[PDB]
């Protein structure tokens, strides 16, 4: 809530949309079709919410336009809060100043999270009067405060830290403040009549405090003194394995202690069809690690030459990954399913579509691609408002189609437009004669 979410291709989807028996509905919670894909996503969701097992990774593949990252975003938002989810681009790991392997280790460690619980006490009430006893030279200030609520009205002496805090900020006796004795923080809630705060109930309460923390930040702050600034800036790396396994043992004994509970998150890695065999071997090893969070791995390339090896590795991946990784495959969408997805998008972005206009938009999306339809349904809004009506007509979308080209038709055009452009050598005819 209260967070920015602009119009995006993954904003419309909200949750997986599948029953308690994990049979998805044909159109529910943002997705249309891909029933087997959605039920597999629910399978992964129950895997991650169980949390008993670790070291699980999956392959989602197929041609483009199959909603792979759509399903990834759906399962991520189904995870929602109370669980960390990390999405990392495959090409992002390539760094020249940061070691690839330990950066990958900290990428895994970011997914793993630790929740620590503690109970703190606090006093809340309406301030009554402000009185202090200090000296101009000798200091030794002795402040006193009268606090009140709906039932209790009492006076307390104000210690040196509290009087310093009360002086450091402009305070009014009509203000309502909350103080935690252990930490000494001052929480100025509101003000009395000059003015929103109206305290009630017990004067002093005790409440629990929970910190959602990932193992990665423990590791970086405990690696060295400058770990704090490295975390807040990103200029870290090459963390020694000694602190690594020491913190691993510490969190293991804390988990068996019951003081704090671990939450093994989900890691998302993308377009790994372009990557290194170093990465493949290291993740092959790391999947067997005891502290291995569930890893989501996505790809789009079929058989191709894996970078770092001469041979064309099948599926763009080495066989060792395929030995330990389970595959999830997604099919295409029918014309009716594409129309339903377009209707869902239109409802999300609130543009009126004519029935014939929407039908021809669907047929031309099936003809060319659905990304083309996604951008056409956006430009149709401005085409329709330039004629001063939110409804999008057939002429709006046809004007958009004749205005913007598709990839295939532009390819054919440059086939008839070869001479006007340089070749791979660089030969062009800028002239006309």
């Amino acid at each position: 809530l209260k967070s920015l979410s602009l119009i995006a291709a993954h904003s419309h989807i909200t949750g997986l949309g599948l029953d308690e028996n994990l049979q998805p509905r044909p159109t529910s919670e943002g997705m249309v079709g891909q029933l087997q894909a959605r039920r597999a996503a629910g399978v992964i969701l129950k895997m991650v919410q169980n949390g008993t097992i670790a070291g699980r990774a999956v392959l989602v593949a197929g041609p483009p336009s199959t909603g792979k990252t759509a399903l990834a975003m759906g399962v991520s938002q189904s995870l929602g809060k109370d669980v960390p989810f990390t999405a990392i681009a495959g090409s992002e790991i390539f760094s020249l100043e940061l070691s690839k392997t330990e950066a990958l280790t900290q990428a895994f460690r970011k997914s793993i999270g630790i929740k620590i619980k503690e109970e703190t006490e606090l006093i809340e009430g309406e301030v009554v009067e402000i009185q202090i006893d200090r000296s101009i030279t000798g200091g030794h200030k002795q402040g006193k405060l009268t606090i009140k609520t709906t039932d209790m009205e009492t006076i307390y002496e104000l210690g040196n830290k509290m009087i310093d805090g009360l002086t450091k900020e402009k305070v009014l006796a009509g203000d309502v403040i909350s103080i935690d004795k252990a930490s000494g923080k001052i929480t100025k809630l509101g003000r009395s009549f000059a003015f929103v705060q109206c305290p009630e109930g017990e004067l002093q309460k005790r409440k629990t405090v929970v910190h959602t923390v990932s193992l990665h930040e423990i590791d970086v702050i405990n690696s060295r003194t400058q770990g704090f600034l490295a975390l807040f800036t990103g200029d870290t790396g090459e963390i020694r394995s000694e602190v690594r396994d020491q913190i691993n043992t510490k969190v293991a004994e804390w988990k068996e202690e019951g003081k704090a509970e671990i939450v093994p998150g989900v890691l998302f890695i993308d377009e790994v069809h372009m990557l290194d065999i170093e990465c493949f071997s290291f993740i092959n090893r790391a999947l067997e690690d005891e502290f291995a969070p569930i890893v989501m791995m996505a790809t789009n390339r079929g058989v191709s030459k894996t970078r770092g090896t001469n041979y064309k590795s099948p599926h763009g991946l080495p066989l060792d990954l395929l030995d330990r990784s389970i595959i999830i495959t997604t099919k295409s969408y029918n014309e009716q399913e594409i129309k339903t997805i377009l209707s869902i998008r239109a409802q999300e972005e609130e543009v009126e579509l004519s029935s014939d206009a929407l039908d021809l938009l669907t047929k031309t999306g099936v003809e060319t691609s659905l990304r083309y339809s996604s951008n056409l349904i956006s430009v149709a809004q401005q085409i329709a408002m330039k004629r001063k009506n939110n409804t999008v007509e057939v002429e709006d979308v046809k004007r958009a189609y004749l205005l913007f080209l598709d990839s295939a038709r532009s390819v054919k055009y440059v086939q008839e437009n070869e001479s006007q452009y340089i070749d791979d050598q660089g030969n062009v005819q800028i002239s006309i004669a």
Partner: protein, 146 residues
């Protein structure tokens, strides 16, 4: 401050004393000026830092007060059983054989933050009636130690 003091545990198990002085070169015998070391020591004395919290947490592993009951497996179940007992709304009678476990029990109970009071040989003659009546009567006290 709270997170940096709750998640700083390790220590550099091996360190070389007096190597810090030679790291900058200041010591009794060096090529730098005689009072250069004095001046840098003095200004470092006036120069302040906010990182000294991490310095004292890393240089020495302070035995935080939390581990009083994390080192006691009996206390691990004791905390949860007192939690469920107060949730049900019941008082308890607890008995031991040695007063040292009574002592550690009172420190633990003050740590968890309960109003309570103990009875043993160290108690005077007069307070026995008041403790008996306060526990017998309906009061906020729920744990009574013997």
């Amino acid at each position: 401050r709270k997170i940096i003091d709750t998640f700083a545990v390790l220590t550099p198990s091996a360190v070389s004393l007096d190597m810090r002085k030679l790291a900058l070169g200041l010591n009794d015998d060096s090529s730098v000026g005689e009072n250069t070391r004095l001046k840098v020591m003095q200004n470092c004395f006036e120069v302040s830092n906010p990182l000294h919290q991490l310095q004292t947490k890393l240089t020495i592993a302070f035995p935080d007060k939390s581990l009083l009951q994390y080192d006691c497996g009996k206390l691990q179940k004791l905390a949860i059983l007192l939690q469920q007992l107060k949730d049900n709304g019941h008082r308890a009678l607890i008995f031991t054989q040695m007063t040292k476990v009574l002592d550690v029990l009172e420190q633990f109970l003050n740590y968890h933050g309960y109003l309570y009071m103990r009875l043993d040989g160290a108690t005077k003659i007069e307070d026995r009636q008041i403790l008996t009546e306060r526990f017998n009567t309906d009061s906020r006290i729920t744990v009574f130690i013997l």
